[PDB]
Amino acid sequence: MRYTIMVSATASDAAPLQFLAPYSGCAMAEYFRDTGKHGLIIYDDLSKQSVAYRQMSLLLRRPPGREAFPGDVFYLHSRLLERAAKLSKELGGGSLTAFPVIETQAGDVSAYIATNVISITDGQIFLETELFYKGIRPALN
Amino acid sequence: DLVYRTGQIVNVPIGPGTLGRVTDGLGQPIDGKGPLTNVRSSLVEVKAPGIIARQSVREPLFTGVKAVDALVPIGRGQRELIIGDRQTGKTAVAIDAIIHQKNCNEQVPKAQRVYCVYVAVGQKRSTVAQLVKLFTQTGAMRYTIMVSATASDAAPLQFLAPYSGCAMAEYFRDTGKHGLIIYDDLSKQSVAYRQMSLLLRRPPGREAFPGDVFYLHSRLLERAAKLSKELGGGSLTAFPVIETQAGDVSAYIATNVISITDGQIFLETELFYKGIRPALNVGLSVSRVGSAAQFPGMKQVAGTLKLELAQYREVAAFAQFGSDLDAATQYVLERGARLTEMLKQKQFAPIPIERQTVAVYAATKGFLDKVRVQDIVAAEEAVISQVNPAVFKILKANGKITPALDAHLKAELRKVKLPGA
Amino acid sequence: PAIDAGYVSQVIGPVVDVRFDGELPSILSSLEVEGHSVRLVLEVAQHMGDNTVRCIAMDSTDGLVRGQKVVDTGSPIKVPVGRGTLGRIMNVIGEPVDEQGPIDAADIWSIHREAPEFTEQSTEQEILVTGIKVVDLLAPYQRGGKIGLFGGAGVGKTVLIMELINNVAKAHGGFSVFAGVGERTREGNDLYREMIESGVIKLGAERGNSKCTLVYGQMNEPPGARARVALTGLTVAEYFRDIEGQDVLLFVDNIFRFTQANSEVSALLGRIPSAVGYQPTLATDLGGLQERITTTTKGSITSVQAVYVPADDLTDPAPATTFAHLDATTVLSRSIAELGIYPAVDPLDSTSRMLNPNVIGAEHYNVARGVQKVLQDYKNLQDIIAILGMDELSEEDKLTVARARKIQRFLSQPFQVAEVFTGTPGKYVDLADTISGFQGVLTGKYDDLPEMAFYMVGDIKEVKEKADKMAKDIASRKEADNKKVSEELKDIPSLDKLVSEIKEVVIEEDDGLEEDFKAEALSSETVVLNEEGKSVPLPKKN
Amino acid sequence: ALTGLTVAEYFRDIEGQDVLLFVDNIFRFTQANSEVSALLGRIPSAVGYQPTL
Amino acid sequence: EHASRMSAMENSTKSAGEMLGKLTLDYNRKRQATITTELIEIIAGASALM
Numbered sequence A: 001m002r003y004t005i006m007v008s009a010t011a012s013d014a015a016p017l018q019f020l021a022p023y024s025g026c027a028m029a030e031y032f033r034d035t036g037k038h039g040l041i042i043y044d045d046l047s048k049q050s051v052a053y054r055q056m057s058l059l060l061r062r063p064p065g066r067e068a069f070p071g072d073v074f075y076l077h078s079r080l081l082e083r084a085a086k087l088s089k090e091l092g093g094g095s096l097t098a099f100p101v102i103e104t105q106a107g108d109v110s111a112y113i114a115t116n117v118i119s120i121t122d123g124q125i126f127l128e129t130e131l132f133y134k135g136i137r138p139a140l141n
Numbered sequence B: 001d002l003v004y005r006t007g008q009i010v011n012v013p014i015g016p017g018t019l020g021r022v023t024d025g026l027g028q029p030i031d032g033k034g035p036l037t038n039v040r041s042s043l044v045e046v047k048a049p050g051i052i053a054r055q056s057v058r059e060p061l062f063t064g065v066k067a068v069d070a071l072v073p074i075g076r077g078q079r080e081l082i083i084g085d086r087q088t089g090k091t092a093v094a095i096d097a098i099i100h101q102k103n104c105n106e107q108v109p110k111a112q113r114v115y116c117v118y119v120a121v122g123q124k125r126s127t128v129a130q131l132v133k134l135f136t137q138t139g140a141m142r143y144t145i146m147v148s149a150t151a152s153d154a155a156p157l158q159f160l161a162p163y164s165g166c167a168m169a170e171y172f173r174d175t176g177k178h179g180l181i182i183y184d185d186l187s188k189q190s191v192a193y194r195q196m197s198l199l200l201r202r203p204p205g206r207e208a209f210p211g212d213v214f215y216l217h218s219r220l221l222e223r224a225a226k227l228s229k230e231l232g233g234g235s236l237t238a239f240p241v242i243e244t245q246a247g248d249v250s251a252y253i254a255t256n257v258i259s260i261t262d263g264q265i266f267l268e269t270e271l272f273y274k275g276i277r278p279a280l281n282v283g284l285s286v287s288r289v290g291s292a293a294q295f296p297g298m299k300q301v302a303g304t305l306k307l308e309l310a311q312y313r314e315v316a317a318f319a320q321f322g323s324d325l326d327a328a329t330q331y332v333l334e335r336g337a338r339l340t341e342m343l344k345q346k347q348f349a350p351i352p353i354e355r356q357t358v359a360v361y362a363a364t365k366g367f368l369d370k371v372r373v374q375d376i377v378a379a380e381e382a383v384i385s386q387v388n389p390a391v392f393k394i395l396k397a398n399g400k401i402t403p404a405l406d407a408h409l410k411a412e413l414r415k416v417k418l419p420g421a
Numbered sequence C: 001p002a003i004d005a006g007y008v009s010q011v012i013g014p015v016v017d018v019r020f021d022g023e024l025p026s027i028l029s030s031l032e033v034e035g036h037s038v039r040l041v042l043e044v045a046q047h048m049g050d051n052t053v054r055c056i057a058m059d060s061t062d063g064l065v066r067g068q069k070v071v072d073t074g075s076p077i078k079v080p081v082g083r084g085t086l087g088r089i090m091n092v093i094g095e096p097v098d099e100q101g102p103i104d105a106a107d108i109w110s111i112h113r114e115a116p117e118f119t120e121q122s123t124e125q126e127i128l129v130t131g132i133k134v135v136d137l138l139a140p141y142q143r144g145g146k147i148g149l150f151g152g153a154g155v156g157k158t159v160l161i162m163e164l165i166n167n168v169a170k171a172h173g174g175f176s177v178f179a180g181v182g183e184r185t186r187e188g189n190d191l192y193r194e195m196i197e198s199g200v201i202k203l204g205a206e207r208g209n210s211k212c213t214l215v216y217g218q219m220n221e222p223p224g225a226r227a228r229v230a231l232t233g234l235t236v237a238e239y240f241r242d243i244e245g246q247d248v249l250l251f252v253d254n255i256f257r258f259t260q261a262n263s264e265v266s267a268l269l270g271r272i273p274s275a276v277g278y279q280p281t282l283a284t285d286l287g288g289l290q291e292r293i294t295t296t297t298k299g300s301i302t303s304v305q306a307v308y309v310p311a312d313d314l315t316d317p318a319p320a321t322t323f324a325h326l327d328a329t330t331v332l333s334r335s336i337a338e339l340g341i342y343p344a345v346d347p348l349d350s351t352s353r354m355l356n357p358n359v360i361g362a363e364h365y366n367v368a369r370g371v372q373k374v375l376q377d378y379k380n381l382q383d384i385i386a387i388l389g390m391d392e393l394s395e396e397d398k399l400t401v402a403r404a405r406k407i408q409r410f411l412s413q414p415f416q417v418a419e420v421f422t423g424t425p426g427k428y429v430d431l432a433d434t435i436s437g438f439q440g441v442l443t444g445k446y447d448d449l450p451e452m453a454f455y456m457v458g459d460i461k462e463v464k465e466k467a468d469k470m471a472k473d474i475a476s477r478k479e480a481d482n483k484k485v486s487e488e489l490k491d492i493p494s495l496d497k498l499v500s501e502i503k504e505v506v507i508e509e510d511d512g513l514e515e516d517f518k519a520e521a522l523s524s525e526t527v528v529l530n531e532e533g534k535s536v537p538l539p540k541k542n
Numbered sequence D: 001a002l003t004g005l006t007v008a009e010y011f012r013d014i015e016g017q018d019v020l021l022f023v024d025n026i027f028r029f030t031q032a033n034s035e036v037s038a039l040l041g042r043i044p045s046a047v048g049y050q051p052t053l
Numbered sequence E: 001e002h003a004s005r006m007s008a009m010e011n012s013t014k015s016a017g018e019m020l021g022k023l024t025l026d027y028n029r030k031r032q033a034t035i036t037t038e039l040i041e042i043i044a045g046a047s048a049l050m
């Protein structure tokens, strides 16, 4: 906790607070990237930010799309994750690496929010629930 | 066009004048016998009785079906789902219950009679007309109200015909008498309510059903209750019917009514075309409320019957069909097939409960092991005919197989001429 | 007097719009409709503009006219809280429905709160033993945590939650609260009569020694009542946690009915629907309710909630949202119940935050991960055993199949609340008897015993005593030939004089349903209301 | 994708040259028109793309 | 060996015909749920605009 910031928009918070907490935490982590230090951000339950963003847009009466998500829900996560970069030497040389977390339903990788963040992020760490119960912990596929 | 308000919430005529009458989903008679005479109007939308207004289900409701009254016992005030595919005997079970109440009402006292209501939602009008001829030539129509919103009737009429028939059945519950309400094709009503909901442009949910399609059936079925002694003590027994597609019971409306009713009667389509009629799936059909409200003696001998049929399903389809035969559990394969043939039953012939438990005592104790499996329906029909009728008056009046009675039962069961052998 | 009184603007099912001319009530404020047949409480949900609020009724709206006077109470729904609610049944709006008189309230608390803050959270992972083998071993329950029982309409979520009342509520020193949300009213009367004979609920002058408060919003109620009766059940539990400082048990029989009843009103609030048909506010309505059920620094709530999965679909958004709000999930399976294994708990779908070797000890943890290892290995062979049989497996994999077929019978257990309809008595299994019993089947100490000896037994002592009974009984086919001789003159009279000692009951012809019946005269022509309000027949025009 | 094509269409038409147009993920052209399609007032087609796909 | 393989493969066509008959109904339920799901997604997007 000496080096860790924790942004926590919990489940009792409003939907625009959970929508904005990945951007609130990335701006705090962008201080270290823009000053020559190195950051590491974990967007735990980024599958829960898209549900919070879906609640605002459906209640702002924006028309729904795939699984009633907004049309610009790819841009919700693409403009968030592209802020995690390794800067050049003329900008300090600092970095920021992101670990977004997406929860799938019954292993369905073909879900709508799941396939967006797979196409945005560089790598994937797939964790299967059937390798988890064979003793393989961490359950890396 | 001018719309006039009648001044009152949606009401149907309820009372003793509804017995014997065929009725649409709104209250007006369709059998052509004049208006309802000795009747009064009550609401179709009544809140169900609460927690203090109810009491525990204690008294049994005999269906007249051997596979029901032995294995899935049903008490007064219960809600029992009849669920299965199309043409698996759903009505064969429901209309044997109505006919059996006509036989029981002529022997019980006045405050123990059961008055039936049959709601036909989305049925053919010919099958409704063929059912009133059945209830008239049996005499069951004297204790039966018939509500019918057929397939040509409007969707609000099929939505409301269960609530109309429940309010006609709630007259007997609220007056200390006992009612028996049957919602034939429970899923149908939900299809007619799905039609009204989508034409009202309401947002559809799972399988395009509305969000309040659980509340469509939960509100209806909670009105079948066994009332407390300070409310007359009357009861209302529901038999909702749900038709499944390809035996899938994980459907939306099917799992809705399973999570509403107390037990289920799963009628399997595989046993129905293998001649086992009624095709009661003995592993899946439960009743955990009317199990305490079971006829004793039948409770004594069907504890052995469903225990022997339990290990009979351990020898299910791999007798020698799967790999091999062991010939030590050959006995249970030639006894579970005897208990299967014991529970088969022809249509429109319900059996009194005191004659059912003797037919199970003849089978579970081993008085039919010599009889081959082809002639057991002839054997147990020869058991009830050749055993003297004095033993059925003892078992009905004592209400249990007394230790004086099973001596004379086993004496009378060894001097019957079983066919074949 | 004309101000602070709105009139009903429009009625769409359970959703009522009220127009307030002078001043509008707050959101979540409770209202009262004058002149209804029952006490109709509306709760303000939305300010719609044009001086109209949008409300959800707590009872039925049938009989509402669009001019009816609606009075603002200036506060949310306030329910009686305190020790005077012990042994009492309350509905959603705090009225006593147990016919025991008024509720002697210590306070009248609103049902709407914020969740307790981040500084008021307790991190104390202590185990709560339940006596259930599949629960104590593979997904142990936290003593102050949230517990979910996920089920698919007939898999045994209510029999499991009644066994948890039978096992851990008697051993608890604090107060229990049962929130019956959207369940069968027959079960609410069953639980009430069971808690009275057990002395958990005492009536009359001994009411102060009761240890349970029942709150019941069952499935005969409109969706406004079923959407707020969980909030009523928390408020009784939140008083014992905050004010009394007690350790509270909260049992919520089906919390899904909170989510389902919020979807029945959301169609009429004019919202665009979310995924499969639920409200757009699914995660924040459930998250607003579930975050109030916590262990704080001044009290613990051990909550056990049943969750209904709607069509045996765990990927449905209402069970999937609930999975993130729990410390221990107990997913019950329809396919395990069809094998006869009860409780039908999926061992490869039930998880707990307590299953950690630094919390439950490394000896209990290594057994549970070994039980889950061979149950997953048996699931990997499930289609090879199907399409090819067990004769094609290895001799090291047929040992995996036979051991996993033994422990999935050994996870089965008879309950003390299931003894009424199964006949077999209930078995409470201690925690150390479960870890030692499941070491033996993993190491190979019980490869001698058959598979069915493990079925529906309590301890590893009881599988050895059932393996003997299965082999005394096959030797009992050669035991004896039982003859019943010389009893006919001992104490059994006859058949014919047995008929003469029955009591004939008088059968009454002419059933006489005209007793106490009033029979109002329904005439032929449809009676309607004219413009002056009088009852007239229909005019002769179309 | 029209900006880079306009540079490739100048080298083809005016310069008369042979051009190599490398377009990384032309799917994102169709995806970006879908992110504005409901806000332009078009009711959606099949799986979630615009009616003008 | 040839005559017990003739019986073990009759039990495999019966097992892979019961598995295929059950998985066809599982596909047909998932087929019917799929056409219902995306159609509800189109009406919910059209009722937001119309």
Ligand SMILES: Nc1ncnc2c1ncn2[C@@H]1O[C@H](COP(=O)(O)OP(=O)(O)OP(=O)(O)O)[C@@H](O)[C@H]1O
Residues within 6 Å of the ligand: B085, B086, B087, B088, B089, B090, B091, B092, B093, B243, B277, B278, B345, B346, B347
């Ligand atoms: N116990 C029985 N013995 C013989 N035949 C029977 C028995 N029970 C039902 N049947 C017959 O099986 C057929 C099924 O008709 P039934 O109305 O009982 O089925 P159902 O499930 O209501 O069908 P549907 O979906 O068309 O309403 C009828 O021909 C009926 O006479």
Ligand SMILES: Nc1ncnc2c1ncn2[C@@H]1O[C@H](COP(=O)(O)OP(=O)(O)O)[C@@H](O)[C@H]1O
Residues within 6 Å of the ligand: B258, B259, B286, B287, B288, C151, C152, C153, C154, C155, C156, C157, C158, C159, C160, C342, C343, C415, C418, C422
């Ligand atoms: N512990 C158990 N032991 C034996 N049978 C059980 C058990 N739990 C459930 N069952 C069976 O499954 C049924 C489920 O009933 P219930 O728990 O009320 O359903 P639900 O899970 O829908 O609330 C019971 O009626 C019984 O037949």
Ligand SMILES: [Mg+2]
Residues within 6 Å of the ligand: B090, B091, B184
């Ligand atoms: Mg029928």
Ligand SMILES: [Mg+2]
Residues within 6 Å of the ligand: C157, C158, C183, C254
């Ligand atoms: Mg339940």
